[PDB]
């Protein structure tokens, strides 16, 4: 892994060398950028018109329609263009509401906040992070384990993964019909809380999208100027990309990140914002090559900092920010791994806005390789390897175990 041997202080020199190579290979970088900008602008004006009409630009589907095979080709096309989808009714509302209360009880009974405070660093940043937590480092509550293995959730993830072009050159880059579980955290945001959550960003790499030759293969049609051929839903190359090692790195390739609502979700009540433009990354990649950007800079992209879109460098994309649709408990929302997103700053609702992080991850060699060490952490109750080794749940009363798993649950965790 070339990104694994790049020293943090050599990044500016690396960027300078790679930017000169990319501008040399794409000498019309300005004209190509302006062409891509026009394509982005048309999508922006459609999204703004949707919002002005009272329509949310994020496609919405019912889980029943996915399960029963009723989704139209036009709906699939809209999802691929917008890069995201709310899927309603994955879980019965009553089950999700019981899950919400059960996570609360699990956190309360086991003194989560006192443990977090006790483990925090004795400095301003340590105290700050532990004071009023919104993102909870618990992985193995019974609601999380049950939601991940649910057979309706599985069918929804298989549907999302089948939107991708999974095969090219004789090779299946992932098996869209097989799901694996990626354990992750849960969020509880109280009314009137501020957010220190990150500004509009894309997870899964920042400087590496330019500096890593595997990432550049994923974006080859962008860097060659043939941007109309760039397909966000092409799988080829994505399991092979290389990241700068840091706590931001996910060991699995996730096709879609996702939220499962434990409570109703509403605009101005701590919900999620997205920019529903699946090919926005093509604009971000080319923007950093323009003449008003310093030779050693990629518009602020930094190691360990999710790639951010900003009013400074990407004001056109900021014009397309949209809240996700209203959701009820048991609904879900998913967004393509390249889709820019950020939680809302405002929560003026009456109750805590709570979600579980549950992504879609297809079977591939990369994701299969993470299952054994993830499984070891489930067995122990430890944090999974991609997270801080808080290991809060090692002695939590009520932590889920293998007894909670169905056969599907076991397969998705690599137990069978």
DSSP class of residue 9 equals G
CA 91 to chain centre: 21
The number of C-alpha atoms within 13 Å of 71 and in the hemisphere containing its C-beta is 22
Closest CA to 326 of 43, 46, 55: 55
Instruction: Residue 144: name the closest of 107, 184, 179, 104 by CA.
Output: 184
Minimum CB distance to Mg ion smaller for 65 or for 203: 203
**CB 216 to Mg ion: min, Å:** 23
Q: How far is the CB of 7 from Mg ion (least distance, A)?
A: 26
Minimum CB–partner distance for residue 147 and Mg ion (Å): 19
- Cα–Cα distance for residue pair 149/173, rounded to 1 Å: 23
* C-beta closer to Mg ion: residue 199 or 404: 199
Closest separation between CB of residue 202 and Mg ion, Å? 8
Cα–Cα distance between 361 and 156 in angstroms, integer? 12
Going by the DSSP 8-state scheme, the letter that residue 60 receives in this structure is E
Query: Would you tell me how many other CB atoms lie within 10 Å of the CB of residue 176?
Result: 23
What Cα–Cα distance (Å) separates residue 140 from each residue in 194, 392, 394? 27, 10, 10
What is residue 168's three-state secondary structure?
strand
Q: How far is the CB of 348 from Mg ion (least distance, A)?
A: 22
Cα dihedral sign, 136-260-141-145: negative
In whole angstroms, how close is the CB of 198 to Mg ion at the nearest point? 6
Summarize as ranges the residues that interact with Mg ion (CB under 5 A): 203
Nearest residue (CB) to Mg ion, 203 versus 297:
203
Is 301 in contact with 314 (CB distance < 8 Å)? no
Provide the minimum distance between the beta carbon of 257 and Mg ion in the complex, in angstroms, as a whole number.
7
Which CB sits closer to Mg ion, 174 or 335? 335
Q: Output 203 or 213, the one with its CB closest to Mg ion.
A: 203
Tokens (6 digits) for 391? 């290991």
Residue 194 to residue 252: CA distance in whole angstroms: 30
Rounded CA separation 229/236 (Å): 14
Nearer to Mg ion, 216 or 341 (CB): 341
Residue nearest to Mg ion (CB): 203
Of residues 258 and 381, the one with the C-beta less far from Mg ion: 258
CB of 203 vs Mg ion, minimal distance in Å: 5
Q: Is the CB of 160 or the CB of 176 nearer to Mg ion?
A: 160
Distance of CA 126 to the CA centre of its chain: 25
């Amino acid at each position: 892994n070339a990104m694994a041997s790049l020293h943090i202080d050599d990044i500016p020199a690396a960027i300078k060398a790679v930017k000169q190579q990319l501008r040399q290979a794409l000498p019309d970088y300005q004209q190509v950028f302006q062409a891509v900008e026009e394509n982005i602008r048309q999508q922006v004006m459609e999204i703004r018109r949707n919002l002005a009409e009272g329509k949310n630009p994020v496609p919405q589907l019912h889980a029943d329609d996915i399960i029963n095979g009723k989704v139209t080709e036009e709906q699939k096309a809209q999802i691929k263009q917008r890069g995201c989808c709310a899927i309603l009714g994955v879980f019965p509302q009553e089950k999700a509401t019981a899950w919400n209360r059960e996570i609360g009880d699990y956190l309360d009974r086991n003194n989560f906040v006192e443990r977090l405070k006790n483990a925090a660093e004795d400095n301003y940043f340590g105290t700050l992070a532990a004071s009023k937590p919104q993102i909870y480092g618990i992985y193995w509550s019974t609601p999380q384990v049950e939601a991940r293995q649910d057979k309706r959730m599985q069918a929804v993830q298989i549907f999302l993964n089948n939107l991708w072009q999974t095969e090219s050159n004789g090779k299946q880059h992932f098996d869209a019909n097989r799901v694996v579980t990626y354990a992750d955290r849960t969020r509880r945001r109280p009314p009137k809380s501020s957010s220190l959550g990150l500004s509009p960003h894309v997870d899964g790499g920042s400087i590496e999208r330019w500096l890593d030759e595997n990432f550049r293969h994923v974006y080859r049609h962008v860097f060659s100027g043939q941007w109309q051929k760039y397909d966000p839903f092409a799988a080829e190359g994505r399991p092979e990309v290389r990241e700068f090692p840091s706590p931001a790195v996910c060991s699995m390739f996730r096709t879609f990140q996702g939220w499962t609502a434990l409570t109703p979700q509403r605009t101005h009540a701590g919900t999620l914002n997205v920019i529903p433009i699946a090919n926005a990354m093509a604009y971000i990649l080319l923007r950093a090559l323009q003449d008003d950007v310093a030779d050693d800079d990629l518009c602020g992209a930094a190691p360990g900092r999710a790639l951010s879109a900003s009013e400074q460098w990407h004001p056109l994309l900021m014009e397309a920010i949209s809240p996700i649709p209203d959701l009820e408990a048991g609904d879900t929302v998913f967004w393509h791994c390249d889709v820019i997103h950020s939680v809302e700053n405002e929560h003026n609702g009456e109750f805590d806005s709570n979600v579980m992080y549950i992504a879609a991850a297809p079977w591939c060699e990369k994701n299969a390789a993470y299952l054994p060490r993830q499984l070891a952490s489930f067995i122990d109750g430890r944090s999974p390897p991609d997270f801080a080794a808080d290991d809060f749940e090692v002695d939590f009363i009520g932590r889920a175990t293998i007894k909670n798993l169905t056969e599907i649950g076991k397969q998705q965790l690599g137990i069978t």
